[PDB]
Symmetry: C2
Subunit: 373 residues, 2 copies
């Protein structure tokens, strides 16, 4: 017995619904312009990247060789020498952000973890999971952490080892927590850079800032301890994956040697997706530095186009520097529902992802918006 | 620019290596006989099951409707009413075992978590992650928990809320921790069933025990709180996935309401694989109860064939009841390396997965083994 008829129908129905809604996305960050056609055929094989890609697995079907080259592409792109970097292709930004917060928690067991109000809900999950001590920090109106309130709270807490959760591209407002500012302000409290942690959540903007003229602080040159990127968000992927990149010195230090049983690798998962590493390898090798930059200039311009056409009209819309998230006041139940806009407190937004080769879908928006004014 | 030539070569090299090694597996539990050809085409779409499948997502490209039907297949297969069950399709057994241990930790914050020496290394990761209090328990020689040492340690600890990690199909020896025995022994210590947790790790055997004549205690009738299964292990999947099934009453109780930020769903991840739920839906709908049973009788018989042919010769090999893991003393550096046998302390093993339509690959083993004797 193969699939019934009602079941075969459901599947084929679903395919049509996906064809229908393939390029639906205007409000979320998941870019839908990829071609991994050439990889469809590898779904034939039981591929398993269980374990560290740097070590070896008797489980022969694994993309470790391709995972290695993705980790060397990101090492270099985030300006850490690959020899000095450790990380892997995760199941999403969340696993990437959990790994980083895990890294900080192990280095600074007593450390309070600090995170703004404009931080991804995923950090709530992480904080419960890792039973880690947490202090919420206020947000500036553009979505940035209230840096001043961070330091105020770091002092009241009398915290010697703060774990800084830095939002590098806020979900709602596209904000970027200036890690260079933070470092200076925590330097000014007389805390050494060695005695505290900074994790970059860069789900979206980790594949923006590297192809921008004047990037904010985010990378390893800029002095972070670990970064998380979402493969599926900006590069585009059919399967959610993540890249996490940390300092080997830190990763190595936190020895996973338990009551008799020895976790043989520094990964959070057991058996890992081996298909997504191929998917990430293709995207990263099928686009030059210049090809991504093009894609992001077009995304950035379009987001300017949208502020413009809206600013000309009554509407006080804006876009943070290097953001592709245009924030404006939230309109009718029609508009947000009929474009799938993420709406969160008197504010909607669109993201000018690069599956828009054209503003057609975006002007389609602004027209249904100016019609309220 | 599309893929270079050296890069296109690497990918095509790799495909040939996978064709070569497609059915290599004799020592690990990952079954390589699946046809998800019909699903290859859905790699075109950016599918994202971010969130709970029972609720709704404005992110339109999701397999929630297919995830729902997989969760109702397992609810029923593990003998809990679907209305009374919660769970999801995870990224592996590990995420399934982390969710369960998370569930226990939240219900019994002070609870020591108990686990045998023959427990998967993944539990070491989990225990560090969830900063949960842990007590190692001895193993009987067949791989089962030293039940007597469990209870001894539950008493010394003066533990009122033990979190029992039950190995339902040990990785090395194929053992099954008898959850009915455990329940009775902890009943006999005068501990109420409501005041402690039992998680089944069933990575492999969760798709064995349901199609066996006399199954051990494992399911919700048998009185567990949560089970984890690995999709890729027994059913077979190109991408590692998991199923975790828990009690709604328990899941719901542990409210994820943090300092201002509200994790909107009871999942551990953010954005989740939407392709693997299809993959699991196909496997579960393309096989009758009788089709799986056939597959597992053949696996069980073959594992008997292997004990037999080895027992006839000098070799003291064995197989626990309902196991498809034939344990024998570990031979030369040749044999284990040249069959990719997982070797762990004077013992090797083969798993008679059902990508062996025939003992040919298995007799190939026993021949290179009897040749030492």
């Amino acid at each position: 017995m193969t699939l019934s008829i009602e079941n075969q129908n459901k599947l084929d129905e679903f395919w049509a619904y996906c064809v229908k809604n393939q390029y639906f996305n205007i409000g979320y960050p998941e870019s839908a312009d990829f071609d991994y056609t050439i990889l469809e055929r590898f779904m034939r094989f039981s591929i398993n990247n269980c374990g560290d890609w740097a070590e070896y697995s008797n489980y022969l079907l694994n993309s470790f060789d391709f995972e290695k080259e993705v980790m060397e592409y990101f090492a270099d792109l985030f300006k850490i020498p690959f020899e000095d970097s450790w990380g892997y292709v995760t199941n999403g930004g969340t696993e990437s952000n959990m790994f980083g917060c895990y890294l900080g928690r192990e280095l600074f067991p007593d450390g309070t973890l600090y995170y703004s109000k404009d931080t991804h809900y995923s950090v709530a999950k992480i904080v419960k999971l890792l039973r880690i001590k947490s202090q919420l920090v206020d947000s500036l109106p553009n979505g940035e952490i209230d840096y001043d309130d961070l330091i105020s709270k770091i002092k009241q807490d009398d915290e010697k080892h703060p774990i800084i959760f830095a939002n590098i591209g806020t979900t709602v407002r596209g904000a970027i927590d200036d890690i260079s500012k933070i470092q200076a302000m925590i330097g000014e409290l007389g805390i050494k850079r060695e005695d505290y942690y900074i994790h970059a959540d860069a789900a979206l903007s980790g594949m923006i800032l590297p192809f921008v003229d004047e990037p904010q602080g985010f990378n390893f040159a800029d002095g972070i301890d670990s970064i998380g990127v979402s493969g599926h968000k900006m590069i585009g992927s059919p399967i959610p994956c993540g890249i996490v990149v940390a300092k080997k010195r830190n990763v190595d230090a936190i020895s996973v040697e338990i009551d008799y049983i020895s976790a043989h690798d520094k990964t959070i998962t057991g058996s890992r997706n081996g298909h997504t590493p191929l998917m990430m390898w293709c995207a990263v090798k099928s686009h030059s530095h210049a090809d991504f930059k093009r894609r992001i200039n077009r995304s950035l311009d379009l987001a300017q186009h949208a502020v413009q056409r809206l600013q000309t009209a009554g509407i006080n819309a804006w876009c943070n520097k290097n953001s592709i998230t245009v924030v404006f006041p939230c309109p009718s139940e029609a508009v947000w529902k009929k474009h799938c806009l993420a709406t969160s407190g008197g504010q909607a937004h669109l993201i000018t992802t690069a599956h828009h080769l054209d503003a057609s879908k975006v002007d389609a928006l602004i027209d249904d918006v100016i019609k309220d004014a």
